[PDB]
């Protein structure tokens, strides 16, 4: 009863998703403490959309979705409403009416590695932009020219995903950043996720 919302199990997770295959953790039927989210020394980014960060303790939601992935520092500026660029357009699109918060910190010490961490991926090509919260994990060879690719690579026929070159010597913007996006839902259903009742 009055089970705490598992925000620890997204912030404190050992390993994060590749942004093309972003992770989504659904949160319901819990009491939320947002105190862990305030006065944050580690968060290089904490911004909220359609709500004041103070008022998260005053509010209730039907569902909360904690989306999580790694991208470059340079690319964190794409994880917002009305944004464009490879990450916004082909990996993780937020809508223009988004209710939620976007949170990010540098993770060069978790997600870079001797001999490089080429294991985090981004989608380099798609035939259209993503709809908001669309998740494309297709490994279909991107045809860029008039000639059909028949499922193999070559001239104007390229793999749709590209590895991040997360070498430890990467400049600050080019280092890996862990990103957590808290989507806040409100609907017809009883608001199952509330702030502290005190």
């Amino acid at each position, epitope marked *: 009863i009055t089970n705490l919302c598992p925000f620890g199990e997204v912030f404190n997770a050992t390993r994060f998703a590749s942004v093309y295959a972003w992770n989504r953790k659904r949160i319901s039927n819990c009491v939320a403490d947002y105190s862990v989210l305030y006065n944050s020394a580690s968060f290089s980014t904490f911004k909220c959309y359609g709500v004041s960060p103070t008022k998260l303790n005053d509010l209730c939601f039907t569902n909360v979705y904690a989306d999580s992935f790694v991208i470059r520092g340079d690319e964190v500026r794409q994880i917002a409403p009305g944004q464009t660029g490879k990450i916004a357009d082909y990996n993780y699109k937020l809508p223009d009416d988004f209710t939620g918060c976007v949170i990010a910190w540098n993770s060069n010490n978790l997600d870079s590695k001797v001999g490089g961490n080429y294991n985090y991926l981004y989608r380099l090509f798609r035939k259209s932009n993503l709809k908001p919260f669309e998740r494309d994990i297709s490994t279909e060879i991107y045809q860029a020219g008039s000639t059909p690719c028949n499922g193999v690579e070559g001239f104007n026929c390229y793999f749709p995903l590209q590895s991040y070159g997360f070498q430890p010597t*990467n400049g600050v913007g080019y280092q890996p950043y862990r990103v957590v996006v808290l989507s806040f839902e409100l609907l017809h259903a009883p608001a199952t996720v509330c702030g502290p009742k005190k």
Partner: antibody
Amino acid sequence: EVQLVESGGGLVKPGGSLRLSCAASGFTFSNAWMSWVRQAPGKGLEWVGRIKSKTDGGTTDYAAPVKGRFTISRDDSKNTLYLQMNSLKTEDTAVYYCTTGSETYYYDSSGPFDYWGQGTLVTVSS
Amino acid sequence: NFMLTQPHSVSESPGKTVTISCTRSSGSIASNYVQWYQQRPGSSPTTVIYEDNQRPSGVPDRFSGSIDSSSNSASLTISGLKTEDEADYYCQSYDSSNQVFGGGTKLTVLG
């Protein structure tokens, strides 16, 4: 302020061997990836090979014509880069530069080639 | 892994505009960042573009980089041609395990 200075280079015969050195200054040589690039007379730039930072794992990459023939190494204690060169050919006749870029623009032990030395001439002839 | 293909030479009058292309032989041009360099005879090279279209501080805005995914090509557009632009130009890019230069493009000022 940043300065690179190559040393070695001269007349050597095919099948022979040489070692080039390059002294580095004005930047964090420890943090830098470093590469050798050569220029054949009246011709373009060919990348010879790379050595990553000690921080990156310190590993070396090589072009096709020089792999298993040349070897790159570094003495961070002397802020110095090396190229060992064995089994030399007419085709290795070039000005050899040591190279890297600004620490601000590093990605995949790579980036712009902002920094070059003077370049030492190697002449491989019978 | 890939190679970069440049036009051997290009030649134009003062105060006009030229473009130099840099076609990637294998894999997408936009897979990794493309750089450009200027080399004057009896000098070492210097960065004139980095990261597809960025300029190092001190380079005139006259020099501008771009990428076309269709022709799998980087480009360097040079505008308001000056007597100092008379130089040899190179593109370069990389794989995780090799750094690759273009063959070169000789610029000359026809006037």
